[PDB]
Design an enzyme around this catalytic site. Structure first.
Site, mmCIF file in Angstrom:
data_model
loop_
_atom_site.group_PDB
_atom_site.id
_atom_site.type_symbol
_atom_site.label_atom_id
_atom_site.label_comp_id
_atom_site.label_asym_id
_atom_site.label_seq_id
_atom_site.Cartn_x
_atom_site.Cartn_y
_atom_site.Cartn_z
ATOM 1 N N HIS A 239 35.677 27.488 15.163
ATOM 2 C CA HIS A 239 36.218 27.478 16.456
ATOM 3 C C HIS A 239 35.209 27.612 17.446
ATOM 4 O O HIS A 239 34.231 28.257 17.491
ATOM 5 C CB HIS A 239 37.201 28.556 16.729
ATOM 6 C CG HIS A 239 37.689 28.527 17.836
ATOM 7 N ND1 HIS A 239 38.547 27.849 18.830
ATOM 8 C CD2 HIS A 239 37.703 29.711 18.828
ATOM 9 C CE1 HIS A 239 39.137 28.435 19.863
ATOM 10 N NE2 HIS A 239 38.452 29.343 20.176
ATOM 11 N N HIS A 240 35.393 26.859 18.637
ATOM 12 C CA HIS A 240 34.521 26.918 19.631
ATOM 13 C C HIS A 240 35.108 27.694 20.792
ATOM 14 O O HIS A 240 36.253 27.092 21.191
ATOM 15 C CB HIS A 240 33.924 25.430 20.059
ATOM 16 C CG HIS A 240 33.069 24.625 19.224
ATOM 17 N ND1 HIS A 240 33.677 23.643 18.213
ATOM 18 C CD2 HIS A 240 31.684 24.821 19.122
ATOM 19 C CE1 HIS A 240 32.395 23.466 17.645
ATOM 20 N NE2 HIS A 240 31.424 23.799 18.090
ATOM 21 N N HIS B 46 43.510 30.111 14.601
ATOM 22 C CA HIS B 46 43.103 28.895 15.307
ATOM 23 C C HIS B 46 44.109 28.357 16.115
ATOM 24 O O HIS B 46 43.947 27.737 17.225
ATOM 25 C CB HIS B 46 42.357 28.435 14.203
ATOM 26 C CG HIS B 46 41.181 27.118 14.956
ATOM 27 N ND1 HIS B 46 40.717 26.162 14.301
ATOM 28 C CD2 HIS B 46 40.814 27.141 16.254
ATOM 29 C CE1 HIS B 46 40.052 25.457 15.367
ATOM 30 N NE2 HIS B 46 40.040 26.206 16.488
ATOM 31 N N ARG C 239 30.538 15.986 18.775
ATOM 32 C CA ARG C 239 30.748 16.786 17.339
ATOM 33 C C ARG C 239 29.906 15.799 16.366
ATOM 34 O O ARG C 239 29.577 16.314 15.218
ATOM 35 C CB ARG C 239 32.187 17.011 16.833
ATOM 36 C CG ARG C 239 32.665 18.073 17.596
ATOM 37 C CD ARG C 239 33.994 18.525 16.698
ATOM 38 N NE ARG C 239 34.855 19.713 17.658
ATOM 39 C CZ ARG C 239 35.522 19.151 18.585
ATOM 40 N NH1 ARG C 239 35.759 17.990 18.907
ATOM 41 N NH2 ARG C 239 36.069 20.205 19.114
ATOM 42 N N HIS D 48 44.641 28.063 20.371
ATOM 43 C CA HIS D 48 44.572 26.759 20.892
ATOM 44 C C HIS D 48 46.106 26.511 21.650
ATOM 45 O O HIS D 48 46.071 25.601 22.695
ATOM 46 C CB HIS D 48 44.280 25.645 20.052
ATOM 47 C CG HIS D 48 42.861 25.297 20.109
ATOM 48 N ND1 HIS D 48 42.188 24.479 20.726
ATOM 49 C CD2 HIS D 48 42.010 25.955 19.143
ATOM 50 C CE1 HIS D 48 40.936 24.579 20.284
ATOM 51 N NE2 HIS D 48 40.713 25.308 19.252
ATOM 52 N N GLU E 223 38.432 28.451 9.425
ATOM 53 C CA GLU E 223 38.103 27.096 10.325
ATOM 54 C C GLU E 223 37.040 27.619 11.305
ATOM 55 O O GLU E 223 37.248 28.663 12.023
ATOM 56 C CB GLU E 223 39.198 26.750 10.967
ATOM 57 C CG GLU E 223 40.373 26.216 10.206
ATOM 58 C CD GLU E 223 41.657 25.619 10.415
ATOM 59 O OE1 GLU E 223 41.898 25.566 11.673
ATOM 60 O OE2 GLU E 223 42.389 25.104 9.715
ATOM 61 N N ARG F 63 46.368 23.597 5.605
ATOM 62 C CA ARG F 63 45.288 24.401 6.070
ATOM 63 C C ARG F 63 45.414 25.665 5.532
ATOM 64 O O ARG F 63 45.952 26.607 5.876
ATOM 65 C CB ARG F 63 45.357 24.430 7.622
ATOM 66 C CG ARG F 63 45.493 22.975 8.266
ATOM 67 C CD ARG F 63 45.776 23.197 9.795
ATOM 68 N NE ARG F 63 44.881 23.938 10.704
ATOM 69 C CZ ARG F 63 45.065 23.773 12.014
ATOM 70 N NH1 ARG F 63 45.684 22.849 12.352
ATOM 71 N NH2 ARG F 63 43.978 24.329 12.899
HETATM 72 ZN ZN LIG Z 1 39.064 25.736 18.091
#
Ligand SMILES: [Zn+2]
EC number: 3.1.-.-
Lengths: 83, 130
Positions: free
Chosen positions: B99-100, B124, B2, B128, B97, B93
């Site tokens: 996200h991949h 998000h 990253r 996950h 966001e 948060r």
């Molecule tokens: Zn993510």
């Protein structure tokens, strides 16, 4: 000084809301800190929505937001601004 | 990975006014095609630098920015992520966001916009989870 609504004059609180609305910070972190502070101060059930997701009809200028907070606290048994 | 330089790639997808509403559902919202057109082939030092560019481009896009209120417009103009509705926030948060979709841990591409999604904090975390 900034522990509760009652520590702020209305003018000082308007300064805070204005800084948030203009994103007048040096980082996203600084802005998030201020918004969290606003939520904790107002105790309004809408939280950050007062700033970012106004109810239809509400004035989301800094002055509009302050008046929404002032009116809600007055109507719900809460203490008000200093002077 | 990253924090290694890369050029942005990929096409994105057509979006509408409900673009950010989609960020709270399923795999999140796509990167808009119009944004991908502006960012493709630009080099970024880190993923954080890419994230900043995404929000700056949103601020400048007349179709995407119109669906943000004045205070959220101010935020994206600084390159910050805009605030989500309250019930999509989780603790500290409070903003959208990136996200991949295919995880970076599994060789997912860092800067391919077809591998990136916009999510709320709540969504998000849930994606996950497992
Ligand atoms: Zn993510």
């Amino acid at each position: 000084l900034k522990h509760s609504i009652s520590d702020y004059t209305e003018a000082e609180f308007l300064q805070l809301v204005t800084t948030i609305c203009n994103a007048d910070t040096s980082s996203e972190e600084e802005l998030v800190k201020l918004v969290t502070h606003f939520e904790e101060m107002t105790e309004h059930p809408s939280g950050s929505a007062l700033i970012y997701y106004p109810k239809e009809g509400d004035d989301d200028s800094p002055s509009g937001i302050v008046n929404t907070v002032k009116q809600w606290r007055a109507a719900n048994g809460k203490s008000g601004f200093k002077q | 990975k990253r924090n290694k330089p890369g050029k942005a790639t990929g096409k994105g997808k057509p979006v509408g006014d409900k673009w950010l509403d989609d960020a709270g559902k399923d795999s999140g919202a796509p990167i808009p095609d119009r944004i991908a057109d502006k960012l493709r082939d630009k080099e970024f030092k880190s993923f954080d630098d890419f994230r900043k560019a995404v929000w700056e481009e949103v601020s400048k896009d007349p179709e995407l920015s119109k669906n943000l209120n004045p205070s959220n417009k101010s935020s994206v103009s600084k390159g910050y992520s805009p605030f989500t509705p309250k019930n999509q926030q989780v603790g500290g948060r409070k903003v959208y966001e990136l996200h991949h979709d295919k995880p970076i841990s599994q060789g997912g591409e860092v800067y391919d916009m077809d591998n990136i999604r916009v999510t709320t904090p709540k969504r998000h975390i849930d994606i996950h989870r497992g």
